[PDB]
């Protein structure tokens, strides 16, 4: 609480200009924050999601979502609280890594690709290392610092676990990006994220291809039980692949832990051209 950590904004220190984008859980914009008085002007992107004390989270989410000192997680700059919640963060230009690998399929090299992976992983690690639960990790939910540096974002879907919590109990989060207990059992775990991360990787690997595309968001379970998983990424040696399909295991505490994904990736990284096969 108090007068420190998590700056709240008087609804006048920022103007909504053009609409950067509208998601399922809200229509984010891109305005300018004028720290009341402080002749200093700032350009950012407003996050006016739309949905009770379900704000305890939002608040507790941001509460740590700002307590960031990692180069891979869009520190929550500030917050807006009216009759409708809004968030601010140091705006990025390029955008969501999906748009990126979509404008550069025939331009990204193994290098970065294997990298992001590790970076993304580093980040998912620090949140895990701070009793957090992302819930919805995806190419879209990740911003581009530089092709050599990427960060993760939030629309406050996370939630901070309280000392005795191991799993979170429940917008909507696209079905296709979540584990099986998340669908079938409205359950959110440090491990479910891993599974989300496997999809992410898939995307990037397939250069942001639509996971499952063609097969309704209904059967994903129907087949997820039948032991069906995303196809293999053409540019992916049957060695990269395995760490992915591995996070999609049915047993949840049998999957690759975050610290780990970094290890096997901070390794592959050491020889990109060896695990991926891209012409250019």
């Amino acid at each position: 609480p108090n007068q420190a950590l998590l700056r709240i904004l008087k609804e006048t220190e920022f103007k909504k200009i053009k609409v950067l984008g509208s998601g399922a859980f809200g229509t984010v914009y891109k305005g300018l924050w004028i720290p009341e008085g402080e002749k200093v002007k700032i350009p950012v992107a407003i996050k006016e999601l739309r949905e009770p004390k379900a704000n305890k989270e939002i608040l507790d989410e941001a509460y740590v979502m700002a307590s960031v000192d990692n180069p891979h997680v869009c520190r929550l700059l500030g917050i807006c609280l009216t009759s409708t919640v809004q968030l601010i963060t140091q705006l990025m230009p390029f955008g969501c890594l999906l748009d990126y690998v979509r404008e550069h399929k025939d331009n990204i090299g193994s290098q970065y690709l294997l990298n992001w992976c590790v970076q993304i992983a580093k980040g998912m690690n620090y949140l895990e290392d701070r009793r957090l639960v992302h819930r919805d990790l995806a190419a879209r939910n990740v911003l581009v610092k530089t092709p050599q540096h990427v960060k993760i974002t939030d629309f406050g879907l996370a939630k901070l676990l309280g000392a005795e919590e191991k799993e979170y109990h429940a917008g909507k989060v696209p079905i296709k990006w979540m584990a099986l207990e998340s669908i079938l059992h409205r359950i959110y775990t440090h491990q479910s994220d891993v599974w989300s991360y496997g999809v992410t990787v898939w995307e990037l690997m397939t250069f942001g291809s639509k996971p499952y595309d063609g097969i309704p968001a209904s059967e994903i379970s129907s087949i997820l039980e039948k032991g069906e998983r995303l196809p293999q990424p053409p540019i992916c040696t049957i060695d990269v692949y395995m760490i992915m399909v591995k996070c999609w295991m049915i047993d949840a505490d049998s999957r690759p832990k975050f610290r780990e994904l970094i290890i096997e990736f901070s390794k592959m990284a050491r020889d990109p051209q060896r695990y991926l096969v891209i012409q250019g």
């Binding site: 499952y212 063609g214 990424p233």
Partner: peptide
């Protein structure tokens, strides 16, 4: 050394992993 031999880059909607029980559920 180890890539998918798809028939015209055609990457299928799904890759099956059954009967493995690490991916196939008790149901």
């Amino acid at each position: 050394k180890s890539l998918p031999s798809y028939l015209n880059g055609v990457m299928p909607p799904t890759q099956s992993f059954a009967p493995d029980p690490k991916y196939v559920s008790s149901k």
